[PDB]
From Swiss-Prot:
Superkingdom assignment: Eukaryota
Record's comment describing the protein's domains: The C-terminal region is the site of focal adhesion targeting (FAT) sequence which mediates the localization of FAK1 to focal adhesions.
Homology family: Belongs to the protein kinase superfamily. Tyr protein kinase family. FAK subfamily.
Boundaries of the shown chain within the full protein: 920 to 1053 of 1053
Cited function: Non-receptor protein-tyrosine kinase that plays an essential role in regulating cell migration, adhesion, spreading, reorganization of the actin cytoskeleton, formation and disassembly of focal adhesions and cell protrusions, cell cycle progression, cell proliferation and apoptosis. Required for early embryonic development, embryonic angiogenesis, normal cardiomyocyte migration and proliferation, and normal heart development. Regulates axon growth and neuronal cell migration, axon branching and synapse formation; required for normal development of the nervous system.
Gene that encodes it: PTK2
Subunit field text: Interacts with ARHGAP26, GRB7, DCC, PIK3R1, PXN and SRC. Interacts with the ARP2/3 complex.
Protein name: Focal adhesion kinase 1
PTM characteristics: Phosphorylated on tyrosine residues upon activation, e.g. upon integrin signaling. Isoform 2 is phosphorylated on serine or threonine residues, but apparently not on tyrosine residues.
Amino acid sequence: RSNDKVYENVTGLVKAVIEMSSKIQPAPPEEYVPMVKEVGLALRTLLATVDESLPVLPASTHREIEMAQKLLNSDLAELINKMKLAQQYVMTSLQQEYKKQMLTAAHALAVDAKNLLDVIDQARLKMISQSRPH
């Protein structure tokens, strides 16, 4: 399997956090939250993909998708409260504390996208795993 829409969209999750990167470039803390909104739409769009991987859950994906999806649910979530936190502690010079807390968390959510990206890539391969011995 050449990593179906499953791998592609999860790449899009990272492309959503590159949105987060671009967002913060010209925009203020007001977009600290919209930028993470970009990565939130990432897991959202990903869930269209997880519904692809979902029929693959019975196939074999039930191993990955439990691990990575539950992982990213918790970590994407932290970023959406890191956008909350950043916009929650929005102060010209003091924000950076919550900024570096958002950054360190962003690295973690980057892993949640990245892990599911490969392991849901393996979801689609999980299906191949069922077709393999046939």
